Design a protein around this ligand. Structure first.
Ligand code: MG
Ligand code: MG
Ligand code: MG
Ligand code: MG
Ligand code: MG
Ligand code: MG
Ligand code: MG
Ligand code: MG
Ligand code: MG
Lengths: 170, 159, 292, 213, 75
RNA sequence: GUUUCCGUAGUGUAGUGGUUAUCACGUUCGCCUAACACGCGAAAGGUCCCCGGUUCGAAACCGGGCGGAAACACCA
RNA sequence: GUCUACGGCCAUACCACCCUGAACGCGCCCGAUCUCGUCUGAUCUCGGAAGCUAAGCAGGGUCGGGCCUGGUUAGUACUUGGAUGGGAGACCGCCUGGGAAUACCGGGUGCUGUAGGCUU
RNA sequence: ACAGAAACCUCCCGUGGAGCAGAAGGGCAAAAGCUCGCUUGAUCUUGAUUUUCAGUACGAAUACAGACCGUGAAAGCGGGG
RNA sequence: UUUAUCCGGUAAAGCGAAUGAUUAGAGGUCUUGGGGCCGAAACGAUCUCAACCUAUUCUCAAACUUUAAAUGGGUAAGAAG
């Protein structure tokens, strides 16, 4: 019997990196738009890199943060493609997790022969009531010792709701 | 020959001491200065506007002005003989109340008080200070010991 | 492994911030610029009206700043307002008015000025700005203190201000942030401040919610149902308050004496009592494993 | 090569550490300020024989080299190759200077005499105060004589004057020899290769829990 | 044709022989240097003093006859 | 010692202002030739001397150095 | 006893971890009718009040790191004046005064300013 | 995910190790670091002082005062950096 | 010359307090490596050397400093109070 340590999803982050700019990026923005239903933020280059074809302050990726129920509704319909199974080393040291997909169509999406197939990074920030203590402005603070989601609490999170196997071996 | 620049040799004066790098505690500009009050200059890095300068870092002078956030202050500065009583316009941050005067004031308040009293007696009280006299004949006593014998101790080479 | 960031060195060199910083409560730079009084004044104070909307209760108080610790001359909270016929919804912009109004009048009862610079009475929601009367005690003034509230248009803070201005303090306030300013035009409606002052925000939420769905009413505001408060009524609770406050602002306290006075913290352990616990162990340990 | 040590025997100048400020320093002659069985233990190797300066002087890097070597040669013989440690405790380190030799050709014509007098880096030297150690050695308690004389020969690569002294500490620790066996047997002191950790009645109790366990 | 490039040698001797006079400070030093808005004002204070002398004189004689009465009531 | 100047493909040498690198020669492969030359088509090849700094970035802009070069070293 | 609001001096206050929260507040919380702010009501604004001290905070704990004192090192190092002191010289000795710092041992762990609660 | 010592994202730590056109030097954090909105306080005008000192200039600075303004809910802050 | 009171960053010290150098061992697949040697290969065994860092230790800094003297520099010790 726990009061409100309802381990629950604070956010779902969708990034679509594509070291290009212009088209091949601008189209990727419509995928997140379509999938989420919110205008995604264009990221840009921290600084220039030569082997890559990217330049400081050039646009590269496009990314979103999805939250509330519509996070649940894209995590579910996310893993599904990864048939409710992940690996041991994605359950991270701070109680977050991450599962990437290969192709954006597999999430109930229509392919246009123009708008190709850019998968995406899904990651999710598990939280808990009273995790906004840090992020607020007045009377900020830190989140206890417990109240911090350990790797192994984030594991049997994912194992008792999406009921995945979480297969070992790296 | 060296550079005349206003802040030479200040590398390690104006430098704030330790673990005080930051917000200037507010008290230090919410105590009141007023003309006649004697004040010790003490330059400070943090604020650079209205700085004094090294040739009077650590001097004292009386105040002759008071502007919105600064204090015009008359200080004596020695210069190949002729000392010059001269006036500068230092921002509050670099200034304190010297407690120099404040032994006297407490000595005055006591003497006027001790003179008004013991006037109804007419007994003459020792008002002036007086330097530390020679320590008076006292006795000592050991009780039931002789004193302890010292010997200088034999040198051996430690390393 | 990694390098341990938090060495001995981390803590030999870590220089604390500056207490009311750690707690995270105070612009001091900005307290600096608010508070410290010019030195063409030496003693005379600088008053600031302090408003921080908490979360349950709005606190407003006039303070002046001394070297031992800023002294509060007058303090008016929101949880007083039951006295003045306002039971509920008392961290709400319209109650910050009454609170700030209270404050202005609890102050102005002292230095005997409740008979002058009343400010606006019927309430409009405009420029009211007090003009000191000649041959009288000149009006009171203070430079509003927001604290840490991102002061966008509509926020309660500079709204409670409107209360203390309306109540007869001469604060420099502009109108650019009162709920009503149009940020694509640059005027008032002012008749939006009408509402915004008297809580027909809350009335019209108490009416969009009700006809759509029941039991979101009651959930969203139970105590707005309980205490037999309604819309329509609302406007004419508050108007009894900015009247009732103004006929009697003064605080009467409540006298206090009883407490038995038990000590139900926990105390500091004395030296010897730590001194043994290590000697108490190490005899619990030694004994335990001189065996198995 | 270099002027004779004479001319840079004495500390006149303020330390010139090799740094940003002087650069192009020829690498110090000496490189190993310890040899023998530096893989020793504290508990098997009990004789902190010392060589100590009696004068405020400078010692060249190249003297230290010789001083070391000639003590590695006599010890070995004496004890064998395994049967000591030698430590030099003056890594030369303020940098010494040379006006650039007043170079001229034949009869010559112009040197400029003194302009830009400031020299260049020549080498490196140690500062040495009185009663300060230069070299130290450890062996078995057995083998005192064979330390004595090894440092004795080293004195002769080496200007001024300096006493050979035998210490009161466990070999290379600071802990006064009359006292280890006790301080170890009860664990004020815990073995740590060459040296030893002094462990006090200070830290968390679970640190202790590991000992006396 | 080289030479000396300073010294501050006998010197102490000189700028000291005649003394080093700690500047002779009068009472009533000049108000030049002070913020004009002081003086702008304290001159209206100083100028309109005499306006208010009738009070001053009578109010003096009140205290003088009250303290002629205080010292005489002691007698 | 001090004052200049260079260093870039296997070699001789261009080149830019801070996005990019050449020529000729050499060489590898075909062709033509009975076979070599010559001629004609294809080709691959350096951290732009070693460095640290600045900068989006340096072969190129600073500072240090290392190798190769040049020029002075006048009154006695 | 204790808290809140505003505070002073800024670690005896920090940090790391362990323990407990009666009431009021202080918090966590619930939502987007409006104001307002976002990619996202994640932060700010606002309207609330269905839960729980999960954390902050507060209260406590650690032969806990740190900071703050004491001791010790040590009358050591260093130094004002002093000598027709020693010493080939480096340097060293004394006389008259002043007199540090580490390692190593101890103790402590924030004091209070105004306004207002609660324990009636 | 592709993604590798380096693209992109998210959590944690992060007293200051960045950053603050430059030599260093001093200064700096819900700043003086970074991002955006609004702009001309780089504006007009007397005087006082500091610094270089002879306590002469220039340059550079500090305090005030008078106008006219930007900014900000406002206190102030701002006469180049 | 005292007594108050500021000011002060040199000698010394420390560097198990920041920066900068630097010896040594215990310790650590931290990392990682590049070589071995035993291993097809295997954080497999054992070596080894790099680099890092966990407790340590040697020795230093004019263009370092937690500390930090001696000698020194302001004021003040009243009728102008
Ligand atoms: Mg602000
Ligand atoms: Mg919300
Ligand atoms: Mg709690
Ligand atoms: Mg709890
Ligand atoms: Mg401790
Ligand atoms: Mg003599
Ligand atoms: Mg700011
Ligand atoms: Mg002006
Ligand atoms: Mg100096």
């Amino acid at each position: 019997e726990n009061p409100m340590r309802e381990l629950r999803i604070r956010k779902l982050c969708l990034n679509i990196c594509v070291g290009e700019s212009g088209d091949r990026l601008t189209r990727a923005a419509k995928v997140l738009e379509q999938l989420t239903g919110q205008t995604p933020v264009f990221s840009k280059a921290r600084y220039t890199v030569r082997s890559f074809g990217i330049r400081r302050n050039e646009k590269i990726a496009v990314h979103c943060t999805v939250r509330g129920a519509k996070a649940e509704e894209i995590l579910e319909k996310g893993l599904k493609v990864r048939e409710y199974e992940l690996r041991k080393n994605n359950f991270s040291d701070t109680g977050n997790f991450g599962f990437g997909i290969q192709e954006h169509i597999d999430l109930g999406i229509k392919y246009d022969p123009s708008i190709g197939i850019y998968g995406l990074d899904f990651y999710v920030v598990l939280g808990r009531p009273g995790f906004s203590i840090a992020d607020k402005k007045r009377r900020t603070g830190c989140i206890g010792a417990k109240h911090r989601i350990s790797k192994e609490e984030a594991m049997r999170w994912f194992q008792q709701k999406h009921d995945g196997i979480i297969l070992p071996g790296n | 020959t060296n550079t005349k620049g206003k802040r030479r040799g200040t590398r390690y004066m104006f430098s704030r001491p330790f673990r005080k790098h930051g917000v200037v505690p507010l008290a230090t500009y919410m105590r009141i200065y007023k003309k006649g009050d004697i004040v010790d200059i003490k330059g400070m890095g943090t604020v650079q506007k209205g700085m004094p300068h090294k040739c009077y870092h650590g001097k004292t002078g009386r105040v002759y002005n008071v502007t919105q956030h600064a204090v015009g202050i008359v200080v004596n500065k020695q210069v190949k003989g002729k000392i010059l009583a001269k006036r500068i316009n230092v921002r509050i941050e670099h200034i304190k109340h010297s407690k120099s005067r404040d032994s006297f004031l407490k000595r005055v308040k006591e003497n006027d008080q001790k003179k008004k009293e013991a006037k109804e007696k007419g007994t003459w009280v020792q008002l002036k200070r007086q330097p530390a006299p020679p320590r008076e004949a006292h006795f000592v006593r050991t009780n039931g010991k002789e004193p302890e014998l010292l010997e200088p101790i034999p040198y051996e080479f430690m390393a | 492994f990694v390098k341990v960031v938090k060495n001995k060195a981390y803590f030999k060199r870590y220089q604390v911030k500056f207490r009311r910083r750690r707690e995270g409560k105070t612009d001091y730079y900005a307290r600096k610029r608010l508070v410290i009084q010019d030195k063409n004044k030496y003693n005379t104070p600088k008053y600031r009206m302090i408003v921080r909307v908490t979360n349950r209760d709005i606190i407003c108080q006039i303070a002046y700043a001394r070297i031992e610790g800023d002294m509060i001359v007058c303090a008016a909270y929101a949880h007083e307002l039951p006295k003045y016929g306002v039971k509920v919804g008392l961290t709400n912009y319209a109650a910050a008015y009454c609170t700030g109004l209270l404050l202005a009048r609890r102050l102005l009862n002292r230095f005997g000025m409740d008979k002058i610079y009343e400010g606006q009475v019927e309430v409009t929601g405009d420029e009211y700005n007090v003009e000191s009367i000649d041959g009288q005690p000149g009006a009171f003034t203070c430079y509003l203190d927001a604290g840490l509230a991102r002061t966008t248009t509509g926020n309660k803070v500079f709204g409670a201000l409107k209360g203390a201005v309306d109540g007869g303090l001469s604060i420099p306030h502009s109108t650019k942030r009162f709920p009503g300013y149009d940020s694509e035009s640059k005027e008032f409606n002012a008749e939006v401040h009408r509402k915004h002052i008297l809580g027909q925000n809350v009335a019209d939420y108490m009416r969009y919610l009700i006809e759509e769905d029941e039991d979101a009413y009651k959930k969203q505001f139970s105590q707005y149902i309980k205490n037999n408060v309604t819309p329509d009524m609302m406007e004419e609770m508050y108007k009894k308050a900015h009247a009732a406050i103004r006929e009697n602002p003064v605080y009467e306290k409540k006298p206090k004496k009883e407490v038995k006075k038990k000590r139900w913290n926990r105390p500091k352990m004395s030296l010897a009592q730590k001194k043994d616990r290590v000697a108490q162990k190490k005899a619990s340990f030694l004994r335990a494993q001189e065996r198995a | 090569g270099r002027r004779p040590a004479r001319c840079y025997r004495y500390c006149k100048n303020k330390p010139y550490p090799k740094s940003r400020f002087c650069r192009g320093v020829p690498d110090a002659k000496i490189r190993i300020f310890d040899l023998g069985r530096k893989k020793a233990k504290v508990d098997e190797f009990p004789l902190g024989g010392h060589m100590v300066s009696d004068e405020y002087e400078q010692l060249s890097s190249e003297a230290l080299e010789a001083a070391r070597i000639c003590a590695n040669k006599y010890m070995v013989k004496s004890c064998g190759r395994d049967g000591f440690h030698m430590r030099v405790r003056l890594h030369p380190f303020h940098v010494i200077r040379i006006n650039k030799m007043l170079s001229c050709a034949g009869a010559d014509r112009l040197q400029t005499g003194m302009r830009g007098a400031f020299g260049k880096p020549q080498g490196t030297v140690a500062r040495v105060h009185i009663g300060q150690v230069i070299m130290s050695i450890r062996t078995k308690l057995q083998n005192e004589e064979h330390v004595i004389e090894a440092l004795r020969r080293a004195k002769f690569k080496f200007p001024g004057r300096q006493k050979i002294h035998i210490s009161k500490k466990w070999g290379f620790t600071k802990f006064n020899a009359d006292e280890f066996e006790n301080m170890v047997a009860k664990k004020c002191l815990i073995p740590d290769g060459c040296g030893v950790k002094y462990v006090p009645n200070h830290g968390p109790l679970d640190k202790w829990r590991v000992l006396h366990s | 044709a080289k030479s000396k490039n300073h010294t501050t040698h006998n010197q102490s001797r000189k700028w000291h022989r005649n003394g080093i006079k700690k500047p002779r400070s009068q009472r009533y030093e000049s108000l030049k240097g002070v913020d004009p808005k002081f003086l702008r004002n304290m001159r209206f204070a100083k100028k309109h003093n005499k306006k208010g002398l009738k009070k001053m004189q009578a109010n003096n004689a009140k205290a003088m006859s009250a303290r002629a009465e205080a010292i005489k009531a002691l007698v």
